[PDB]
Write a protein that binds this ligand. Structure first.
Ligand SMILES: O=C(Nc1ccc2[nH]ncc2n1)[C@H]1CCCN1C(=O)C1(c2ccc(Cl)cc2)CCCC1
Length: 324
């Protein structure tokens, strides 16, 4: 028995939900080479995103658009048991803008960052397991009353680690098209299960929505669009803001997914969003810097199966001894 295992991490309703979904899938496949997956929310805290000077001037100060949007941020990780030792192979960071959030951020979630380490066993279920987690998250927030999800299909630069320090040298970074097709395959799956109603690139979605002002575009921490509007307001300063937006959306439409989970009249009468889970203050999983620093300091790589398993044990040790 191992008092610092992933299974013994404090459970959450979300974590349970997700891992039950994955293990159900795994049991159905009945593959002799696979192991039990464990999913753990390891951080959850409330924050707000502050509207930046340019946009504040044109829209906030004149009472058209709230100064700040609050959201709950969360970090979660998934683990496979491979002959009795844990392996961390997947991490996700989300932003959840609840029902008492001012529009246009209301009832939306944003996937900040996705990362993995390609050591899941067997190789031929890795993509499927990533899909079951991602679809599982969508199913859950929908259940609770979030209407729309958002993804930015941004492949990193060579050497830029998103969550896991030092990737294997032979884990290819996907080209943008490949990453976009991969997300489409995942969302298609969720449409068949009637989880997602539909999904569209950001340009087509803003068109259908008859969006006319930049204040109507959701404002997410760390996202492309806040900074695009800023550079866009400096470019009008140096000489319409809506025409600039719609063009930047067109050029880059294929990278920005808008996923609709509840549409039509069903979205207009929803009860408030209440999170059955408590906050989880954990400085190590507060954004992606604290975990990446810890890995540099302790020379924890994630570049081979046995290295990543060693690194998993350390992260689990930290994680338990800070939750204690
Ligand atoms: O590649 C990644 N991260 C890496 C990989 C190798 C690396 N070398 N150096 C840095 C680096 N980062 C991250 C960043 C974007 C998507 N990632 C994924 O993991 C996921 C993915 C991987 C391949 C495909 Cl086709 C589609 C999706 C797997 C889990 C969910 C998304």
């Amino acid at each position: 028995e191992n008092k610092f295992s992933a299974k013994r991490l404090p459970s959450t309703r979300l974590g349970t939900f997700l891992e039950n979904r994955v293990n159900d899938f795994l049991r159905r496949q009945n593959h002799p080479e696979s192991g039990e997956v464990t999913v753990r929310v390891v951080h959850a805290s409330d924050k707000t995103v502050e509207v930046k000077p340019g946009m504040k001037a044109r829209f906030v100060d004149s009472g058209e658009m709230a100064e700040s949007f609050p959201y709950r941020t969360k970090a979660l990780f998934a683990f496979e048991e491979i002959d009795g030792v844990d392996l961390c192979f997947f991490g996700m960071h989300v932003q959840e803008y609840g029902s008492d959030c001012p529009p246009p951020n209301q009832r939306r979630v944003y996937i900040s960052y996705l990362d993995s380490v390609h050591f899941f066993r067997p190789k031929c279920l890795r993509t499927a397991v990533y899909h079951e987690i991602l679809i599982g998250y969508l199913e859950y927030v929908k259940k609770l009353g979030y209407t729309t999800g958002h993804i930015w299909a941004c492949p990193p630069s060579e050497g830029d680690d998103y969550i896991f320090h030092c990737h294997p040298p032979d884990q290819k970074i996907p080209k943008p098209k490949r990453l976009q097709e991969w997300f489409k395959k995942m969302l298609d799956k969720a449409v068949s299960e009637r989880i997602v109603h539909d999904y569209k690139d950001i340009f087509k979605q803003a068109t259908e929505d008859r969006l006319t002002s930049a204040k109507e575009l959701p404002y997410f921490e760390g996202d492309f669009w806040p900074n695009v509007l800023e550079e866009s307001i400096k470019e009008l300063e140096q000489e319409d803001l809506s025409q600039k937006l719609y063009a930047t959306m067109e050029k880059h439409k294929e990278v920005f997914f808008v996923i609709r989970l509840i549409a039509g009249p069903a979205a207009n009468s929803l009860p408030p969003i209440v999170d059955p889970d408590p906050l989880i203050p954990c400085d190590l999983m507060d954004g992606r810097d604290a975990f990446l620093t810890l890995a540099r300091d302790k020379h924890l790589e994630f570049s081979s199966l046995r290295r990543a398993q060693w690194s998993t044990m350390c992260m689990l040790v930290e994680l338990h001894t800070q939750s204690q």
